[PDB]
């Protein structure tokens, strides 16, 4: 019983905490991404 | 007078561009690290 | 000042409306010299617009000229 439930308790935190580092990368390059078209119709913006 | 606030205007915002160049340039590498890290625990 | 007219796909803040203009004026008490002087010696908010400055001062002698010349 203690050999495989805390083993599976390897990948209950293992999978799900994978999936959560994914959150933030959407919530970073994303966010940082549209700094970049803030400057592109910026540089029109000169004109 | 208006020609060469005209002219200048055209150098002043192709130089942002290449200021914008490597700007952009930054998110190719922005990807790999926030995912190639991701690849090996899945696995 | 890049999203202010770029959420407004506008290219200039005088063209943007002045309820914007108003709003980073309340956070941002120095923009009023260039948005709200009547008539600023340079033209607020551009870049050229100090070459402005002097190419119409070069038209300026010009004139002082050809006029007394004449």
Same mark, same amino acid.
């Given at each position: 019983?203690?050999?495989?439930?805390?083993?599976?308790?390897?990948? #209950?935190?293992?999978?799900?905490? #994978?999936?959560?580092?994914?959150?933030?990368?959407?919530?970073?390059?994303?966010?940082?991404?549209?700094?970049?078209?803030?400057?592109?119709?910026?540089?029109?913006?000169?004109? | 007078?208006?020609?060469?606030?005209?002219?200048?205007?055209?150098?002043?915002?192709?130089?942002?561009?290449?200021?914008?160049?490597?700007?952009?340039?930054?998110?190719?590498?922005?990807?790999?690290?926030?995912?190639?890290?991701?690849?090996?625990?899945?696995? | 000042?890049?999203?202010?007219?770029?959420?407004?796909?506008?290219?200039?803040?005088? !063209?943007?409306?002045?309820?914007?203009?108003?709003?980073?004026?309340?956070?941002? &008490?120095?923009?009023?010299?260039?948005?709200?002087?009547?008539? &600023?010696?340079? !033209?607020?908010?551009?870049?050229?617009?100090?070459?402005?400055?002097?190419?119409?001062? !070069?038209?300026?002698?010009?004139?002082?000229?050809?006029?007394?010349?004449?």
């Amino acid at each position: 019983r203690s050999t495989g439930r805390s083993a599976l308790a390897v990948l #209950i935190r293992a999978c799900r905490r #994978i999936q959560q580092q994914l959150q933030r990368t959407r919530r970073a390059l994303f966010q940082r991404s549209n700094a970049v078209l803030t400057s592109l119709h910026h540089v029109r913006m000169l004109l | 007078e208006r020609a060469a606030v005209l002219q200048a205007q055209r150098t002043a915002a192709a130089a942002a561009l290449e200021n914008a160049a490597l700007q952009a340039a930054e998110l190719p590498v922005d990807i790999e690290r926030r995912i190639r890290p991701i690849e090996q625990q899945v696995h | 000042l890049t999203e202010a007219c770029a959420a407004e796909r506008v290219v200039r803040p005088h !063209q943007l409306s002045p309820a914007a203009q108003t709003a980073l004026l309340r956070r941002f &008490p120095a923009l009023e010299g260039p948005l709200r002087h009547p008539r &600023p010696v340079l !033209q607020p908010f551009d870049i050229a617009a100090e070459v402005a400055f002097v190419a119409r001062i !070069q038209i300026a002698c010009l004139r002082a000229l050809g006029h007394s010349i004449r």
